[PDB]
Amino acid sequence: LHKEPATLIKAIDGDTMKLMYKGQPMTFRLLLVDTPETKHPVEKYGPEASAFTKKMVENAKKIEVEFDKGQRTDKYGRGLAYIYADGKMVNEALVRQGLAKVAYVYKPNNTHEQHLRKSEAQAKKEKLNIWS
Amino acid sequence: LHKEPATLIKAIDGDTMKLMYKGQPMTFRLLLVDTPETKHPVEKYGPEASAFTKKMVENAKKIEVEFDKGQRTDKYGRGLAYIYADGKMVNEALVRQGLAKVAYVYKPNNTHEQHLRKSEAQAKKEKLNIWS
């Protein structure tokens, strides 16, 4: 796996954002996590998660995307990646805060599954947000 | 944020101590500050800060811990908190004396950041210890 540059266009919610990738606007969805819903007819913590992600990506010097080993886009045409803001994985950051659950683990896009799972466990142990 | 009871087990240095929290021994590290080093291969004021903290927590009737809004432990498994000795925040007391600098401000655990920064400013104006 390798990290590639991208440019933030717009934060959408906790786990979705619009990025400029290779000179094309693309919706990206975070691999291996689910932040709570705020669009589809609002879950508890859905708003917080969004704010968190929005802040984390807006404030970054650099945004990078890292595809996994399998599919790079979902059925909705969303890029599927691990996305890093100045080197800190957004996917992990959310989970570590109890603002996301590890979810949608579709092989073979599961390289960071164990890392994320352990962040989840700590968050759960610390009774943070979703786990509170 | 809410204050929770704990029991002193041992003062370690200026910004680290061992407490009994919910019936288990844990190392705790003070949020938002850094006292000078005395362990890792001895900075100026390190010994002074240790003594201050040790005195403040040993003489207390009650010790309380106050977690902030995010992570409750660091990578070393140390609890991250605002610690209060008879209602007095140890973190602030140190800063107020110029025995610690405000440091390691890692969002979102930054609730008392401003209060501490003001204490620091006064300690600096007064040319205390580290700022002397």
Ligand SMILES: Cc1cn([C@H]2C[C@H](OP(=O)(O)O)[C@@H](COP(=O)(O)O)O2)c(=O)[nH]c1=O
């Ligand atoms: C994270 C992820 C989501 N998805 C799909 C699964 C869900 O589709 P369905 O809605 O049709 O079940 C949806 C979850 O995304 P959201 O959490 O953005 O809704 O996106 C993937 O196909 N692969 C992925 O890796």
Ligand SMILES: Cc1cn([C@H]2C[C@H](OP(=O)(O)O)[C@@H](COP(=O)(O)O)O2)c(=O)[nH]c1=O
């Ligand atoms: C105060 C604090 C320290 N730490 C870490 C940062 C430093 O890690 P590194 O040692 O890996 O740089 C270390 C500083 O504490 P000390 O002053 O006890 O060294 O503890 C946190 O991760 N979060 C915190 O809130």
Ligand SMILES: [Ca+2]
């Ligand atoms: Ca979601």
Ligand SMILES: [Ca+2]
């Ligand atoms: Ca220190």
